[PDB]
Chain A
Amino acid sequence: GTGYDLSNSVFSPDGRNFQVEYAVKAVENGTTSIGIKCNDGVVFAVEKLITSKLLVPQKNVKIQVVDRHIGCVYSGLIPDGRHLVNRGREEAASFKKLYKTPIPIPAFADRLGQYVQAHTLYNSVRPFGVSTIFGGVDKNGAHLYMLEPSGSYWGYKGAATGKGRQSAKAELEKLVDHHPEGLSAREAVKQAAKIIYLAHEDNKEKDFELEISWCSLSETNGLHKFVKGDLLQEAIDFAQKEIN
């Protein structure tokens, strides 16, 4: 019959969970965000739609840090993203308390995965209305991950989600082909700014603000840091020159 899409934990006759699929629609509706894995780190970037002149520029920060070495960005219901990161931070602290070492990114990815998956197991909760892109540097290199509302996650060379994900993915695929030996952190930052600008043609009706962060062994000492000042402008200038 029908009614299979009204409760969270319910399997439809073709084996699907419609409430998770509806959560994806909330993500697809959201702002575009990306991640770029470089040869000793990762770069994150996001589009911030400027609704009005009244929004204070450079405030309303969207990218979040976990521990000291992990960056997270997400598209969809922003509060759900914060909730997820709060959990991530609790989870990373626990790991460090017991095992001393900072949480490895793969270990951290599964911690978010298991938590998000848990919210598809019962009808007394709703799934997360975000896809989260995250990663950083650990004992053995850089890692980039994307985590969907189902709890599904994989490692990526580059990742994109939100309104302009097709544009971003198309640009991400060109970089993977044309830089097979590996991209640098400096380059990836500039290249990320470009992709957010090219992806912004989907939300071209309104103005936007660019935000970038990065975690690199040589550029940031393996710590997550935001891109500000002269380096941020250099990336914006590069994107504007590439758009024309």
Chain B
Amino acid sequence: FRNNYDGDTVTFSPTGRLFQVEYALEAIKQGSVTVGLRSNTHAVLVALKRNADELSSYQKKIIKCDEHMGLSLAGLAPDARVLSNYLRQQCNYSSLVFNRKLAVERAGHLLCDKAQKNTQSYGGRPYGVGLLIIGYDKSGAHLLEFQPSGNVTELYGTAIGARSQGAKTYLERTLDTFIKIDGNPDELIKAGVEAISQSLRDESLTVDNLSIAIVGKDTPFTIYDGEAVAKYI
């Protein structure tokens, strides 16, 4: 068991499991925590960036995909780059060909299908990264959770990475409050920072440690780093 059935993604275990996919899932858990949440007017990403040394920079975890869509990552950053690039192209294709901003729901379906092809063919490997996609389209604010198994889920709020369960239980309690935060971006970010801090343990949220992103009704997807997020610590 396990030993014999985890050599490649093309092999089912005797209980119907896909261990290579499950090992890829484990790369996300080792990844640094990031939180997503939304109301009816805005959607917010908050991420805890990780460094190597005190001499090193903090690995950026948020990537803009279009003016109305973007995502945060936990796991293999190179794989997030590939998937975010694909999403950038799909968003771009929709605009050029149909003059239409891509629905966040359709973006989720496209990621699912792209991840799935890597879980059924020989020689490849699953993607070793998880993604939280936020956006504002023709049906309002949206937040998605992408796992490299191919499973994509629309949520009000969630978290991924190490110790992400803390932030997730907080949001699960705070649900009725933060969903009502309409027409107030600062207050949604506060609720996102209070959630991300639930997953802390090692350190405190410093100025070059924290990264935040916001998208909404009259707000293009925009990333905040450094002194721009000093007012939230």
Contact = CB atoms under 8 A, between A and B. Distances in A.
Would A and B touch once assembled, by the CB under 8 A criterion? yes
A129 B150 CA distance: 13
A22 B119 contact: no
A6 B5 contact: yes
Contact of B113 (A23, A27, A77, A83): A83
A115 to B, nearest CB: 12
Interface in B98-152: 105, 109, 112-113, 115-117, 119-122, 149-151
Given A23-B12, A24-B16, A29-B15, 15 more contacts: A6-B4, A22-B12, A53-B156, A54-B156, A54-B168, A55-B154, A55-B155, A55-B156, A56-B154, A82-B109, A82-B116, A125-B120, A125-B122, A126-B11, A126-B12
A79 B149 contact: yes
B11 A60 contact: no
Contacts of B149: 77, 79
Contacts of B150: 77-79, 82
A174 interface: no
Contacts of A83: 113, 116-117, 120
A83 B200 CA distance: 39
B206 interface: no
A91 interface: no
Nearest to B115: A79
A240 interface: no
B155 A29 contact: no
Contacts, number: 93
6 contacts: A26-B12, A79-B116, A79-B119, A82-B116, A126-B10, A129-B16
Contacts of B120: 80, 83, 119, 125-126
Interface of A: 5-6, 8, 19, 22-29, 52-56, 59-60, 77-80, 82-83, 86, 119, 123-127, 129
Contact of A54 (B12, B15, B117, B172): B172
Nearest to A27: B16
A25 B15 contact: yes
Interface string B10-29: 11111111100000000000
B175 interface: yes
Nearest to A83: B116
B49 to A, nearest CB: 24
A14 B117 CA distance: 32
A125 B175 CA distance: 43
Contacts of A6: 4-5, 11
A78 B142 CA distance: 21
Contacts of A22: 12-16
Give the one of B4, B112, B116, B172 with max A CB within 10 A.
B116
Contact of A124 (B105, B116, B121, B155): B121
B94 interface: no
A124 B9 CA distance: 10
A54 B116 contact: no
A202 B112 CA distance: 28
B199 interface: no
Interface in B17-70: 17-18
Contacts of A26: 12, 16-17
A5 B14 contact: yes
B158 interface: yes
B121 A56 contact: no
Interface string B147-174: 0011101111110000000001001100
A60 B143 CA distance: 12
A52 B167 CA distance: 13
Contacts of B113: 79, 82-83, 86
A79 B120 CA distance: 10
A196 to B, nearest CB: 20
A26 B15 CA distance: 7
Contacts of A52: 168, 172
Contacts of A79: 112-113, 115-116, 119, 149-151
A126 to B, nearest CB: 5
B10 A56 contact: no
A55 B171 CA distance: 12
A5 B5 CA distance: 9
Across chains A and B, which 4 residue pairs bring their CB atoms closest together, nearest first?
A79-B150, A25-B16, A26-B16, A79-B116
